Design an enzyme around this catalytic site. Structure first.
Site, PDB file in Angstrom:
ATOM      1  N   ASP A  44       0.401  -1.728  -0.187  1.00 25.11           N
ATOM      2  CA  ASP A  44       0.238  -0.229   0.236  1.00 25.11           C
ATOM      3  C   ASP A  44       0.732   1.391  -0.120  1.00 25.11           C
ATOM      4  OD1 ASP A  44      -2.666   0.818  -0.224  1.00 25.11           O
ATOM      5  OD2 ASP A  44      -2.623   1.244   1.804  1.00 25.11           O
TER       6      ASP A  44
ATOM      7  N   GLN B 172       0.603   9.811   1.314  1.00 27.57           N
ATOM      8  CA  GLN B 172      -0.278   9.628   2.503  1.00 27.57           C
ATOM      9  C   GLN B 172       0.278   8.128   3.308  1.00 27.57           C
ATOM     10  OE1 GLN B 172      -1.851   9.636  -0.339  1.00 27.57           O
ATOM     11  NE2 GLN B 172      -4.077  10.068   0.099  1.00 27.57           N
TER      12      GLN B 172
ATOM     13  N   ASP C 140       1.991   2.250   7.635  1.00 31.50           N
ATOM     14  CA  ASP C 140       0.763   1.138   7.362  1.00 31.50           C
ATOM     15  C   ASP C 140       0.758   0.192   6.954  1.00 31.50           C
ATOM     16  OD1 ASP C 140      -1.872   0.673   6.899  1.00 31.50           O
ATOM     17  OD2 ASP C 140      -2.345   2.666   7.041  1.00 31.50           O
TER      18      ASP C 140
HETATM   19  N1  LIG Z   1      -2.060   5.411   8.311  1.00 30.55           N
HETATM   20  C1  LIG Z   1      -0.581   4.860   9.516  1.00 30.55           C
HETATM   21  N2  LIG Z   1      -0.172   3.768   9.674  1.00 30.55           N
HETATM   22  C2  LIG Z   1       1.249   4.362  11.039  1.00 30.55           C
HETATM   23  O1  LIG Z   1       1.781   3.384  11.160  1.00 30.55           O
HETATM   24  C3  LIG Z   1       0.962   5.362  11.118  1.00 30.55           C
HETATM   25  C4  LIG Z   1       1.848   6.279  12.165  1.00 30.55           C
HETATM   26  C5  LIG Z   1       2.398   7.414  11.814  1.00 30.55           C
HETATM   27  C6  LIG Z   1       2.894   8.455  12.289  1.00 30.55           C
HETATM   28  C7  LIG Z   1       2.238   9.369  12.943  1.00 30.55           C
HETATM   29  C8  LIG Z   1       1.628   9.330  11.569  1.00 30.55           C
HETATM   30  C9  LIG Z   1       0.977  10.353  10.532  1.00 30.55           C
HETATM   31  C10 LIG Z   1       0.378  10.624  10.107  1.00 30.55           C
HETATM   32  C11 LIG Z   1      -0.470  11.524   9.489  1.00 30.55           C
HETATM   33  C12 LIG Z   1       0.324  13.064   9.814  1.00 30.55           C
HETATM   34  C13 LIG Z   1      -0.823  14.687   9.083  1.00 30.55           C
HETATM   35  O2  LIG Z   1      -1.081  14.422   7.841  1.00 30.55           O
HETATM   36  O3  LIG Z   1      -0.385  15.666   9.389  1.00 30.55           O
HETATM   37  C14 LIG Z   1       0.820  13.560  10.748  1.00 30.55           C
HETATM   38  C15 LIG Z   1       1.070  11.789  11.381  1.00 30.55           C
HETATM   39  O4  LIG Z   1       0.925   8.587  11.915  1.00 30.55           O
HETATM   40  S1  LIG Z   1       0.037   6.675  10.633  1.00 30.55           S
END
Ligand SMILES: N=C1NC(=O)/C(=C/c2ccc(-c3ccc(C(=O)O)cc3)o2)S1
Lengths: 258, 296
Positions: free
Chosen positions: B127, B131, B145
């Site tokens: 994936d 994003q 992710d």
């Molecule tokens: N879909 C996901 N899978 C993970 O392991 C994730 C871990 C993670 C850590 C930090 C973030 C994060 C994601 C998006 C944003 C923003 O859009 O500002 C800021 C921080 O995701 S997110």
């Protein structure tokens, strides 16, 4: 056939050692025996055949159960619950379509509730600390099969058959690593069907000489010869079918000449 | 769970929401991924089960770090290192200015290192979209992710077909192929590389057939010469329009001769000919590589 084969082989060789059960854990289980585990594993073979689950899923669940019983005392009437949650987790990890909890509850014939199966799923994840990506005899055998010059289906089916027979009997097979059992199983399958031996290219890939496979291979030759007499018979039945080239019908070699 | 104060919902991931949170005792800023649970139904989702166990194996600077699993009866929380934003937001914020080539080169170099680590530990991500790729203030980018990820075998079995966000989905999935492996992650990365260069998605299809045709119009329609076995694939139709290959000088104008060499190796039709993440790290495009900080 790629660029990652050796890297993965080397990593699975590190992981198999970190993922092994304690060899003697059964001597410290005050209510369960090897013959009870053998009845449980044989049943998981049937469950797998009923649900059309991968052989990999069977190997994984046996690893989860043996590591779980490495640190946890279990009474006999709770053993099938350990096995059910383990097969549930293995299916979730490995299958495209894992069976449902309610289907797992049905195959225990309502011995346990749904609540119980799911509470045990949570305890197995706790005890295993979510470390579910374990090497199996299966993973090694499939790599080894790439060395058959050229691809023989009966050899592969018999190797699978033998690697699965090793799951049933914790004494002696808890003593050996997945990669060793797979070497032995492959050598023996090869020898039985074609007369050839553990190949030089695999001696080189694995670091295992035919001598070094000798202890596991003596054991597995015995398990093979006595297979039709053994109390547990689900593996032999499964391996009679035409998707396995009926390999459990083949006659073992009487002598190994090793 | 009582040591965390929630700061803000920062998204919805592949499954369940992600919050910004801080540790009340140490000050540490973390990301919480909340996963909802059932008794009365299926247990821990197979998707969480994969994610957590694979993440335990995947400790690398370019893979998001799992700090803790908070596993209650009612709720499951994953605790992650905090990262500033995702590459999709970064890309949108710099859509007029562009991402500097030294930082595109950096980010790709790092994504490939994370990916090589994944692949050589028998994990498919499945994936890679912008994003799911997170960036910090210091010039680091990380794979995130692992909900759709899978531990694979050598050689591979058949896995889920229902795989990869359409725009980053490899032609061998689109064409209904029985087997797929690590080359599908390289495809997605090729798509992202180009997206960074041009500021727009390379192949923005809206159905499987439209996605294929957008691929065909850019790279040419594949034949037996270019990809042995194509015309024999399950969802291949010999009535497919035969388009010619677009010149990369037109496809991705900002990119020099080395960058275009690499991209065309990442977007090779034949999954077996398509460059691996280890080989890609060794490409002349990366000789000059630095670690610039995002000019946000
Ligand atoms: N879909 C996901 N899978 C993970 O392991 C994730 C871990 C993670 C850590 C930090 C973030 C994060 C994601 C998006 C944003 C923003 O859009 O500002 C800021 C921080 O995701 S997110």
């Amino acid at each position: 056939v790629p660029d990652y084969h050796e890297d993965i082989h080397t990593y699975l060789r590190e992981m198999e050692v970190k993922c092994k059960p304690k060899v003697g854990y059964m001597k410290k289980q005050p209510d369960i025996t090897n013959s009870m585990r053998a009845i449980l594993v044989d049943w998981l073979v049937e469950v797998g055949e009923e649900y059309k689950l991968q052989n990999e899923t069977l190997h994984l669940a046996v690893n989860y159960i043996d590591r779980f019983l490495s640190s946890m005392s279990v009474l006999r009437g709770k053993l099938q619950l350990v096995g059910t949650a383990a097969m549930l987790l293995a299916s979730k990890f490995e299958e495209i379509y894992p069976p449902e909890v309610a289907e797992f509850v049905y195959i225990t014939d309502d011995t346990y509730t749904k609540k119980q199966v799911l509470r045990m799923e949570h305890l197995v994840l706790k005890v295993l600390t979510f470390d579910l990506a374990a090497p199996t005899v299966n993973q090694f055998l499939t790599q080894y099969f790439l060395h058959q010059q050229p691809a023989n289906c009966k050899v592969e089916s018999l190797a699978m058959f033998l690697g699965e027979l090793s799951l049933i009997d914790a004494d002696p097979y808890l003593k050996y690593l997945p990669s060793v059992i797979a070497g032995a199983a492959f050598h023996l399958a090869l020898y039985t069907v074609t007369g050839q031996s553990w190949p030089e290219s695999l001696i080189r890939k694995t670091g295992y000489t035919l001598e070094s496979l000798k202890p596991c291979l003596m054991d597995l030759h015995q398990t093979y010869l006595k297979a039709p007499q053994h109390a547990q018979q689900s593996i032999r039945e499964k391996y009679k079918n035409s998707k396995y080239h009926g390999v459990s019908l083949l006659n073992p070699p009487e002598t190994l000449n090793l | 769970m009582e040591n965390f104060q929630k700061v803000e919902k920062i998204g919805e991931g592949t499954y369940g929401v992600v919050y910004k949170a801080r540790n009340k005792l140490t000050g540490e800023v973390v990301a919480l991924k909340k996963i909802r649970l059932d008794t009365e139904t299926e247990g821990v989702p197979s998707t969480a089960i994969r994610e957590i166990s694979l993440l335990k194996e995947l400790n690398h600077p370019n893979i998001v770090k799992l700090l803790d699993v908070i596993h209650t009866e009612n709720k499951l929380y994953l605790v992650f290192e905090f990262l500033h934003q995702d590459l999709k937001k970064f890309m949108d914020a710099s859509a007029l200015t562009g991402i500097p080539l030294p930082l595109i080169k950096s980010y790709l170099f790092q994504l490939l290192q994370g990916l090589a680590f994944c692949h050589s530990h028998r994990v498919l991500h499945r994936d890679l979209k912008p994003q799911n790729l997170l960036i910090n203030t210091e010039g680091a980018i990380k794979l995130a992710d692992f909900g759709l990820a899978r531990a694979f075998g050598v050689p591979v079995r058949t896995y889920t077909h229902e795989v990869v966000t359409l725009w980053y989905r490899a032609p061998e999935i689109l064409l209904g192929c029985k087997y797929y492996s690590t080359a599908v992650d390289i495809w997605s990365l090729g798509c992202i590389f180009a997206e960074m260069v041009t500021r727009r998605a390379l192949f923005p299809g809206d159905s499987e057939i439209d996605q294929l045709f957008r691929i065909f119009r850019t790279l040419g329609t594949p034949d037996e010469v270019v990809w042995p076995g194509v015309t024999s694939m399950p969802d291949y139709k010999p009535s497919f329009p035969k388009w010619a290959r677009q010149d990369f000088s037109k496809v991705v104008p900002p990119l020099d001769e080395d960058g275009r060499s690499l991209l065309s190796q990442m977007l090779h039709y034949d999954p077996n000919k398509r460059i691996s993440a280890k080989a890609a790290l060794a490409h002349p495009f990366f000789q000059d590589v630095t670690k610039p900080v995002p000019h946000l």
